[PDB]
Symmetry: C2
């Protein structure tokens, strides 16, 4: 049967969805408890948050992981396995919106200075936030790539850590020197570009998956030579590779043979060699006689 | 050759990209001229816009249409043809953000009433906006579906038309009865739900394309019977259909044959019958002997 070699690709996926669900679930509880500490800390202090969207970011990334367990349907024939890639794009988009709003809020503070703020509250608030974010980063943190959902709930955690550094640095200089208060808002600006830089290597490895591009991990040239290693085959055209999710790849190609007879042996030999370089989700390979091959058609050009 | 029947699918696409580029280009010029009318209308009136994002919405939908003309590459093997689907998702997202901001702005006006506004400016501004939006809607406005880019620059145009109706109704009731000014803000609320309803039948026909779902236009059952019409074939398993863009579909299936000999005739017969029901972008069909078929494997279940 042609489904014999798919066990390895099926076995690994089941372990990764359970392992990633457990790790993300534990971190959600810590965030929920940490938020509750603000309310019980005080009334006036708690009256004056950013942690509200943290609950949403840790709910979408976990709710979307449940739909990936759904079965097939006459629509969405492959399945719901791409819900994690598309469900981890909204989380990264949320980082851009929150930073943009916070930058706009900081801009208003620059033109209109304020003095009602007190440094005592800032120091105690920064210390509590720094500890919670640092521990939450550690628990989230041929070799398979990282999951496409734990890689989108980790950039947000490191995003809030930088703001914690910025507020501590800004508050520290105020105590040492009360003057030059105009340099307080610019601390956010100098520590906001870094948040918009760390989200550039994620929004590229995740945007070539949503437009049928070859994922990181497999090389086009390596696969092309592997098929040609078989003595029976002659040439390959219209090779197609695309990634259904981050660590699942699919293959589809044409093969031209020299001898029409005993073509079943060629099909079995090619499949075994292809599967010896990567665990493929599925593979579909045609056979075409050499006498019908034509080189003048445009579609066979790379 | 196996590329003989792809001419029909290639010919139609070239015409649609040129026809859609011409229509969208003309509408952009009208919007640019219409915006310039506000500045030359007056100084104090022009000092006190929403049309700024209209230029961006009519630039992304046209700039993204250029990348779809790019050639293939060792990465993104299929091509850049899905840039229009992904480039028409940001335009719809922009509608949600603008409405949300405008709703928030209207909320502040409700709690804090204002009287500095004059109805004379509102009436003349609404009349000019209503005419420009109405004409722009008309020019944009087996049978192929509409393009995936003209269907995302048309929802925005009809989105601004409803706001033009709302401001005219709100201004009209003020002149008839200066009292009950608290009913002015609710006019926007009663005419903002409609904008968030008209963008629900678009964000569904466009989200099952980005997750390898069957598009509107082709039925799974119809294709399955078409292959089985051939006397040579016995059964089909692991049938896969997905849409690369809105009006381009791809097929991939397995076929089990009874007689090993003369298998080349079966491959040619199946391809002709499949192409007689829909113009397919590409088709890949395997052949598997009956003696190797096994029914106990789980992967052959629908
Ligand atoms: Zn099979
Ligand atoms: Zn955050
Ligand atoms: Zn060819
Ligand atoms: Zn071929
Ligand atoms: Zn608009
Ligand atoms: Zn099977």
């Amino acid at each position: 049967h042609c489904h014999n070699n798919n066990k390895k690709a099926y076995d690994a996926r089941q372990r990764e969805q359970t392992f990633a669900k457990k790790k993300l679930c534990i971190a959600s509880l810590i965030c929920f408890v940490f938020i509750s500490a603000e309310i019980v800390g005080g009334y006036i202090a708690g009256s004056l948050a950013h942690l509200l969207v943290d609950l949403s970011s840790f709910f979408i990334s976990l709710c979307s992981l449940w739909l990936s367990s759904k079965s097939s349907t006459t629509r969405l024939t492959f399945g719901w396995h791409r819900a994690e890639i598309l469900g981890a794009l909204m989380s990264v988009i949320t980082i851009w919106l929150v930073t943009g709003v916070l930058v706009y809020l900081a801009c208003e503070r620059l033109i209109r200075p304020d003095y009602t703020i007190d440094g005592t509250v800032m120091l105690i608030t920064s210390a509590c936030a720094l500890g919670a974010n640092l521990v939450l980063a550690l628990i989230l943190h041929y070799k398979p790539q990282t999951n496409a959902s734990i890689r989108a709930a980790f950039i947000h955690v490191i995003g809030d850590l930088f703001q914690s550094i910025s507020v501590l640095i800004s508050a520290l200089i105020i105590y040492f020197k009360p003057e030059y208060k105009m340099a307080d808002p610019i601390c956010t600006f100098i520590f906001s570009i870094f948040v918009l830089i760390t989200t550039v290597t994620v929004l590229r490895d995740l945007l070539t998956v949503l437009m049928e591009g070859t994922p990181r991990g497999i090389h086009y040239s390596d696969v092309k030579q592997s098929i040609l290693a078989v003595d029976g085959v002659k040439s390959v055209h219209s090779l197609h590779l695309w990634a259904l999710t981050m660590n699942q790849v699919i293959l589809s190609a044409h093969i031209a043979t020299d001898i029409v007879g005993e073509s079943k042996r060629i099909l079995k030999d090619v499949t075994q060699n292809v599967f010896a370089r990567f665990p493929f989700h599925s593979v579909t390979i045609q056979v075409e006689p050499i006498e019908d091959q034509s080189p003048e058609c445009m579609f066979c050009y790379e």
